[PDB]
Amino acid sequence: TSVQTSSLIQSLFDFRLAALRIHQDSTAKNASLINALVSRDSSRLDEFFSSVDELELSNAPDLRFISSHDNILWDDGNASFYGIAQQELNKLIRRVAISGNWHLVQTPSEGKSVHILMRRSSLIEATGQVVGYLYVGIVLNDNFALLENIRSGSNSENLVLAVDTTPLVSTLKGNEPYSLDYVVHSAKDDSFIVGQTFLEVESVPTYLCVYSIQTNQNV
């Protein structure tokens, strides 16, 4: 049941991205927002999002920022928490320039390329002129909540998300019979079976590899 665990993992991953896409695409049509943006006052924008999130938490993106062309109008400010220079968002804007589709992008951040999944929705005016684009993103590095979600949803023993040989995040606690290092340089299919699943983003192959460790139940 290898391909089964792998597809399970992929559906769980697909599920999370879906939760965000839907929430994004809806906020992108929230007159309250559109008008708070055209109003040109960062407060309603801040408040708008703080309220948006006040109850849909954990289903909230890690990064969020509105922008018209290269002119970033508003930013939730979480970019800095990730060690991402307001500058490094402008380059991501061009990189993700194809609305309604998720993009796996990298970005420099204090000596470690940070891997992010991004997507943009256009903010139209109730007049029909596009007024900007809302950019939403999920940071993969150290995103334990995302990996833990997928681990329990698939009832996996442990999981580790790596950009091959290099771990982005793990569920291991440090008491397992196996080390993170082992899990990462281990053969695909032993006492501890180690599965390997390359995630697809929008049905497209990706270098994101999720390792699933299952203990040989024989034992």
UniProtKB/Swiss-Prot annotation:
Gene giving rise to this polypeptide: luxQ
Role played: At low cell density, in absence of AI-2 (autoinducer 2), LuxQ has a kinase activity and autophosphorylates on a histidine residue. The phosphoryl group is then transferred to an aspartate residue in the response regulator domain. The phosphoryl group is transferred to LuxU, and ultimately to LuxO. At high cell density, in the presence of AI-2, the kinase activity is inactivated, and the response regulator domain has a phosphatase activity.
Quaternary structure note: Binds the complex formed by AI-2 and LuxP.
Domain of life: Bacteria
Organism listed in the record: Vibrio cholerae serotype O1 (strain ATCC 39315 / El Tor Inaba N16961)
From-to range in the entire protein, with total length: 52 to 274 of 857
Compartmental location: Cell inner membrane
Protein name: Autoinducer 2 sensor kinase/phosphatase LuxQ
